[PDB]
Amino acid sequence: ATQGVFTLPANTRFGVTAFANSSGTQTVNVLVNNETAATFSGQSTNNAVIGTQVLNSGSSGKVQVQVSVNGRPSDLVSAQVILTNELNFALVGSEDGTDNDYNDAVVVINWPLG
Amino acid sequence: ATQGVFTLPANTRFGVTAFANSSGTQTVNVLVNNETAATFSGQSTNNAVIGTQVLNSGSSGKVQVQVSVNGRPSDLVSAQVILTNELNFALVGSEDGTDNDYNDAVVVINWPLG
Amino acid sequence: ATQGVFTLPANTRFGVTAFANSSGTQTVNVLVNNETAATFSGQSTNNAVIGTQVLNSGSSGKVQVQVSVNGRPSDLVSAQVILTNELNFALVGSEDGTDNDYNDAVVVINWPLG
Amino acid sequence: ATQGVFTLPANTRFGVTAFANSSGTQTVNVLVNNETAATFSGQSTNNAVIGTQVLNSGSSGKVQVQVSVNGRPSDLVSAQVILTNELNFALVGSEDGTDNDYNDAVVVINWPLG
Numbered sequence: 291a292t293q294g295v296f297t298l299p300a301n302t303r304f305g306v307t308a309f310a311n312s313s314g315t316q317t318v319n320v321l322v323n324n325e326t327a328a329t330f331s332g333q334s335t336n337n338a339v340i341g342t343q344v345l346n347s348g349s350s351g352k353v354q355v356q357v358s359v360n361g362r363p364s365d366l367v368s369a370q371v372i373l374t375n376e377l378n379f380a381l382v383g384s385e386d387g388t389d390n391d392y393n394d395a396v397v398v399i400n401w402p403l404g
Numbered sequence: 405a406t407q408g409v410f411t412l413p414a415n416t417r418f419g420v421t422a423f424a425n426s427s428g429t430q431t432v433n434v435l436v437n438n439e440t441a442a443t444f445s446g447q448s449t450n451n452a453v454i455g456t457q458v459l460n461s462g463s464s465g466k467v468q469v470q471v472s473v474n475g476r477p478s479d480l481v482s483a484q485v486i487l488t489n490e491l492n493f494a495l496v497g498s499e500d501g502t503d504n505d506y507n508d509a510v511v512v513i514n515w516p517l518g
Numbered sequence: 519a520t521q522g523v524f525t526l527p528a529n530t531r532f533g534v535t536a537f538a539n540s541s542g543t544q545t546v547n548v549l550v551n552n553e554t555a556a557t558f559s560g561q562s563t564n565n566a567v568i569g570t571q572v573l574n575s576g577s578s579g580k581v582q583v584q585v586s587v588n589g590r591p592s593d594l595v596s597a598q599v600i601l602t603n604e605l606n607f608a609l610v611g612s613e614d615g616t617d618n619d620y621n622d623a624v625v626v627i628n629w630p631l632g
Numbered sequence: 633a634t635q636g637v638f639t640l641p642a643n644t645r646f647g648v649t650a651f652a653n654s655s656g657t658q659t660v661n662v663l664v665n666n667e668t669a670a671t672f673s674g675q676s677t678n679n680a681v682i683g684t685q686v687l688n689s690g691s692s693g694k695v696q697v698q699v700s701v702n703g704r705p706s707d708l709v710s711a712q713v714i715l716t717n718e719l720n721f722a723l724v725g726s727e728d729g730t731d732n733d734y735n736d737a738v739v740v741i742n743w744p745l746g
């Protein structure tokens with residue numbers, strides 16, 4: 291199935307934060323309405339934050355996360371979970387290698403903000 | 405129900421990260437096997453990452469998150485989600501006020517690392 | 519925090535299924551737009567299905583699950599999970615006793631159908 | 633990523649329930665320790681419960697869901713959710729066609745029971 295694609299409410303600010311757990315430099319691209327809105331880059335094996343930003347979901351609300359490492363797209367796993375009918379998490383894990391730990395870049399999207 | 409309590413695998417490193425979305429200064433306490441292991445604080449209405457840390461779950465794997473604002477416990481919501489039977493997120497929201505956005509402090513725990 | 523309340527897309531059919539795991543007879547009510555839409559009751563300690571129905575979320579999309587045992591409201595815990603940005607689960611557990619298993623009535627809502 | 637594979641606690645009873653939403657007849661197989669322990673088949677476009685069963689995770693705890701339509705495997709999506717650190721849902725959707733609704737067979741596993 292497609293992974294890393296989420297429909298947010300329109301015109302809504304959301305947070306996006308990425309963590310790295312890999313020897314490879316992770317490049318995380320966040321696309322809003324099909325256009326690149328943020329790009330994070332970094333390397334850690336200790337869950338460092340490699341980027342955080344606040345974005346607006348725009349007219350459609352479409353948000354897509356993509357991850358690549360040494361020019362190759364990582365395999366993604368994702369889900370959205372909603373707590374108390376209010377608090378939304380869009381979660382992505384990614385795998386750049388052969389161990390299927392799926393933590394190589396971890397991306398958390400959360401809304402609402404404020 | 406009790407919220408903000410998670411059983412992790414024993415002797416496992418995990419990340420804990422907190423975000424703020426409130427006019428009130430948030431204080432986030434992270435307990436591991438019933439003793440404080442990390443404390444984060446800050447004040448933002450734009451999702452600032454007020455703290456992030458790597459901890460070890462220790463022998464019994466018990467991790468608890470508590471949130472307070474001006475000495476008053478916040479009401480918590482939480483859940484754990486597991487992707488591809490590998491990648492774990494323990495999620496907490498909290499409410500310090502009257503609007504029930506539950507984002508006033510948001511805490512994300514992730515494992516495994518590395 | 520409020521539990522067992524979910525906002526569905528309007529005019530959408532959804533399934534609701536309830537299971538029992540308790541010595542007490544479980545009464546499960548499903549409200550749509552603040553009005554009773556379905557009621558199930560039964561008793562099992564081995565996960566029997568005590569009710570299943572297809573409902574329409576109607577003009578409001580507002581769905582609430584309530585659980586009680588002989589006039590005593592059970593404590594609920596709930597969350598919504600979305601897979602591949604398409605497949606939705608609204609999940610409820612409930613506790614009628616002292617063991618905090620939260621399985622005494624379990625309610626699963628899923629959409630879309632068809 | 634692998635989907636539909638879950639690690640349960642050993643020697644633990646769990647419920648498994650399957651729903652259908654497709655013109656095609658769904659075949660759902662639930663494997664415990666790599667052998668089929670339950671099978672359900674049926675056709676519905678209205679979320680029929682094509683089967684429910686209580687199984688034991690046995691000595692290994694590995695549980696796998698497979699879905700096919702006249703022998704053709706369906707693509708799966710899955711996740712596990714844990715509420716109040718005690719109530720577990722393992723969730724599966726599947727796609728047999730071209731519309732990406734992922735509801736063609738839906739499988740929910742819950743534990744603990746009793």
Ligand SMILES: CC(=O)N[C@H]1[C@H](O[C@H]2[C@@H](O)[C@@H](CO)O[C@@H](O[C@H]3[C@H](O[C@@H]4O[C@@H](C)[C@@H](O)[C@@H](O)[C@@H]4O)[C@@H](O)[C@H](O)O[C@@H]3CO)[C@@H]2O)O[C@H](CO)[C@@H](O[C@@H]2O[C@H](CO)[C@H](O)[C@H](O)[C@H]2O)[C@@H]1O
Nearest residue numbers: 539540541542563613614615616617618619620621622746
């Ligand atoms: C009927 C039965 O199962 N008897 C068991 C006894 O079971 C208890 C135990 O399950 C407790 C857990 O809190 O709950 C008692 O029931 C209370 C109700 O709880 C609900 O139903 C339960 C069955 C659980 O599903 C629970 O999660 C639910 O919340 C509650 O709603 C109600 O208001 O009050 C009830 C109590 O009045 C339930 O009776 O457990 C004992 C100890 O395990 C069993 O005794 C043991 O039996 C084994 C054989 O299996 C053996 O004989 C052993 O020596 C003996 O101690 C008893 O059979």
Ligand SMILES: CC(=O)N[C@H]1[C@H](O[C@H]2[C@@H](O)[C@@H](CO)O[C@@H](O[C@H]3[C@H](O[C@@H]4O[C@@H](C)[C@@H](O)[C@@H](O)[C@@H]4O)[C@@H](O)[C@H](O)O[C@@H]3CO)[C@@H]2O)O[C@H](CO)[C@@H](O[C@@H]2O[C@H](CO)[C@H](O)[C@H](O)[C@H]2O)[C@@H]1O
Nearest residue numbers: 632653654655656677727728729730731732733734735736
């Ligand atoms: C039988 C039926 O429902 N006929 C409908 C027609 O429905 C389509 C549509 O649902 C597509 C979606 O991809 O799938 C067709 O079935 C395919 C199988 O898909 C599975 O079953 C489906 C019912 C869905 O659940 C889907 O999610 C499943 O994956 C697939 O497994 C198989 O390999 O191939 C199948 C054929 O492609 C299904 O037939 O939809 C049309 C258009 O909406 C309906 O026609 C409209 O009917 C209304 C009245 O309701 C009115 O008459 C209107 O004018 C007319 O266009 C048709 O009745």
Ligand SMILES: CC(=O)N[C@H]1[C@H](O[C@H]2[C@@H](O)[C@@H](CO)O[C@@H](O[C@H]3[C@H](O[C@@H]4O[C@@H](C)[C@@H](O)[C@@H](O)[C@@H]4O)[C@@H](O)[C@H](O)O[C@@H]3CO)[C@@H]2O)O[C@H](CO)[C@@H](O)[C@@H]1O
Nearest residue numbers: 404425426427428449499500501502503504505506507508
């Ligand atoms: C003074 C100001 O900025 N006014 C804008 C107003 O802001 C409100 C509104 O957000 C309400 C929502 O309940 O909360 C008030 O703040 C609370 C505070 O709530 C916390 O902080 C908020 C910013 C928000 O994040 C809440 O979710 C959070 O719980 C409480 O903690 C505190 O005890 O009491 C204060 C005061 O009541 C905000 O001041 O929002 C509107 C709507 O956008 C704007 O028009 C105002 O300019």
Ligand SMILES: C[C@@H]1O[C@@H](O[C@@H]2[C@@H](O)[C@H](O)O[C@H](CO)[C@H]2O[C@@H]2O[C@H](CO)[C@H](O)[C@H](O)[C@H]2O)[C@@H](O)[C@H](O)[C@@H]1O
Nearest residue numbers: 311312313314335359385386387388389391392394518
């Ligand atoms: C540290 C390690 O990084 C990543 O794996 C890399 C991979 O991206 C790259 O292409 O190739 C190397 C060498 O094989 C990988 O590193 C090894 O990964 C092993 C596990 O598969 C093991 O961790 C070795 O210690 C590494 O040298 C990640 O995909 C991996 O999860 C892990 O974080």
Ligand SMILES: [Ca+2]
Nearest residue numbers: 387391392394
């Ligand atoms: Ca990896």
Ligand SMILES: [Ca+2]
Nearest residue numbers: 311391394518
């Ligand atoms: Ca890794």
Ligand SMILES: [Ca+2]
Nearest residue numbers: 501505506508
């Ligand atoms: Ca608030």
Ligand SMILES: [Ca+2]
Nearest residue numbers: 404425426508
């Ligand atoms: Ca807030």
Ligand SMILES: [Ca+2]
Nearest residue numbers: 614615619620
């Ligand atoms: Ca109970």
Ligand SMILES: [Ca+2]
Nearest residue numbers: 539619622746
């Ligand atoms: Ca019970």
Ligand SMILES: [Ca+2]
Nearest residue numbers: 729733734736
């Ligand atoms: Ca389909």
Ligand SMILES: [Ca+2]
Nearest residue numbers: 632653733736
């Ligand atoms: Ca379908």
